[PDB]
Design a protein around this ligand. Sequence first.
Ligand SMILES: COc1cc2c(cc1OC)CN(C=O)CC2
Ligand SMILES: COc1cc2c(cc1OC)CN(C=O)CC2
Ligand SMILES: [Mg+2]
Ligand SMILES: [Mg+2]
Ligand SMILES: [Mg+2]
Ligand SMILES: [Mg+2]
Ligand SMILES: [Zn+2]
Ligand SMILES: [Zn+2]
Lengths: 324, 323
Amino acid sequence: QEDVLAKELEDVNKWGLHVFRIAELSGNRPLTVIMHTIFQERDLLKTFKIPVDTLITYLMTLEDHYHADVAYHNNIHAADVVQSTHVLLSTPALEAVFTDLEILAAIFASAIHDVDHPGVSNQFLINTNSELALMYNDSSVLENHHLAVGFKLLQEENCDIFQNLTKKQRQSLRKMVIDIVLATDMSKHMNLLADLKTMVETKKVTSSGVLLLDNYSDRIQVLQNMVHCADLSNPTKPLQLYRQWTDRIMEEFFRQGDRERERGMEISPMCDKHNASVEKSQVGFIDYIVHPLWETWADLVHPDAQDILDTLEDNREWYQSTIP
Amino acid sequence: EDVLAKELEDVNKWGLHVFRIAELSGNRPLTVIMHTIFQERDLLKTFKIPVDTLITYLMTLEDHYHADVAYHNNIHAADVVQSTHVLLSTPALEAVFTDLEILAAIFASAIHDVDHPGVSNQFLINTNSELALMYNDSSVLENHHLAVGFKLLQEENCDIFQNLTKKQRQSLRKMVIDIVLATDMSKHMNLLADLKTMVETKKVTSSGVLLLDNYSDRIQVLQNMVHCADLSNPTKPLQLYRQWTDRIMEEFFRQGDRERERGMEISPMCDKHNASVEKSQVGFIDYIVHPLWETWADLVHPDAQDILDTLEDNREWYQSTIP
Ligand SMILES: COc1cc2c(cc1OC)CN(C=O)CC2
Ligand SMILES: COc1cc2c(cc1OC)CN(C=O)CC2
Ligand SMILES: [Mg+2]
Ligand SMILES: [Mg+2]
Ligand SMILES: [Mg+2]
Ligand SMILES: [Mg+2]
Ligand SMILES: [Zn+2]
Ligand SMILES: [Zn+2]
């Protein structure tokens, strides 16, 4: 079984990794084993002098703080966003663009970006006067919490994977990670996409043909949209993966809608298991959110992501075909 | 208790004897000044606030300002409340703000520094504090002030908004959050630029009363109004101003002592062995306080003239104390 797991982890550089199989083969440790594999593949333990036992201890604690009883926003989702970011970081249009520290920030941000997610939306937490929404003044409630947990866990016994970074390195990494995870709040999507389109329309490329990003604002904006793309990458995956993600998000949505219906609240969009159209909701999600984003990312790295965009468009056609 | 009532008759005036009221009230200036302002604006009848609930909340809120913090305590909170109360009655702002916006501005003022530890956001970030960890280094204190102010409403007989509709509560909450987050000094320059923009394009009646049609402009004015109240010490009668300066320097110096003991770089104006209190006040007026208050004065022209005159008198006096 360990041999089969190792075989599957050989696909870590590929879009469409068998992440649900890896979750089973690893004993529900997909985040730990995929993060470890990526850190080895990118030589990050050597570069940042991360003790392997410290990395594994932190990853297992982080993974533990994802909720195993939440259908979508769990450790498998985290592992999936990590691996998807890892693939996007390797796109030819970004070769030698980002530093090792920026690469570390994007991958760490992906790993922590939904930690301790309770399986309900920001709007639900606000409308129910939750302790989280009270702590965070209704503003990026979950995303602020994911950051606070992800950073706090570094202080647990033998968990500081950044113990050998310089002070300036730690300061820079912390700021970049905060900037990246806060950009996963869907309330920021429209402004984030508008900005990404502006960068595409004005983009500069070097003599080697890679993106020229010569200031923090442009560099962090690319990393923010990269992780946001990874977070919204399910409909761009092979259909057997995409359908499992759809099954999971609908279960999570329906459980929230059951709580809203109980409380006499208006049921959130797509959360009513008695008045649901899963297929129409996927086509709308793709048409208004996922394809606008991924078409713009594909434009930024053109033509690196053409196959990913082609898969998204095929999956949209497939879901659309199940309506009439 | 009769002299206390005598002092409170100036509640509508710039320069209220807030330190005298703090002493006469048994260190309850926030409670008695908030209560006075709520009665004077009839906010209890307008919003069906039981007087026992108001007093209970106000005492609990006041209890969560630190008595061993020289500046950011309940006297400062009461001062900002009462200052906001006066600025809300600016004639050039007549008919601008709804009753809920007025309640939001006054409530925001009361909670805007609650549970302040007497050290800056940068100190909290640099010492890897639990507060900075919770709030991801962003408006750390101001997020905490809001969280405490609202959490205290859930204490027994403390929900002063219990007879507001759900929609009214949601609207007030958003406004209060927007106002208190704007008291973070790292937002001052952007706030001032937006106040300036509003001054350049301001629309008034023939009588010179401001016309603010959209919520974005109205919340910007309320943010700058409470920010002005927060930064109003140099605009008060000099005797009050000098007491505030003594307190902020005591607080700054206590921060610099903690920084020195920890081996940290001492924050500006926080080194008691290398301070220039008077030069610092002149620079603070010249670069922060006067630009803000003269822009505010342009917005409400001529209603802020006496306040601006006091500020300029006080700047001249502090400069004269520099040899
Ligand atoms: C796979 O389908 C979806 C995935 C996700 C959403 C919606 C979807 O379909 C309508 C919205 N999100 C909320 O957290 C992000 C993930
Ligand atoms: C009375 O003098 C001052 C007051 C205040 C500051 C600085 C001052 O002088 C230099 C800065 N602030 C920090 O919280 C607001 C209050
Ligand atoms: Mg999220
Ligand atoms: Mg403050
Ligand atoms: Mg109108
Ligand atoms: Mg005069
Ligand atoms: Zn996510
Ligand atoms: Zn203040």
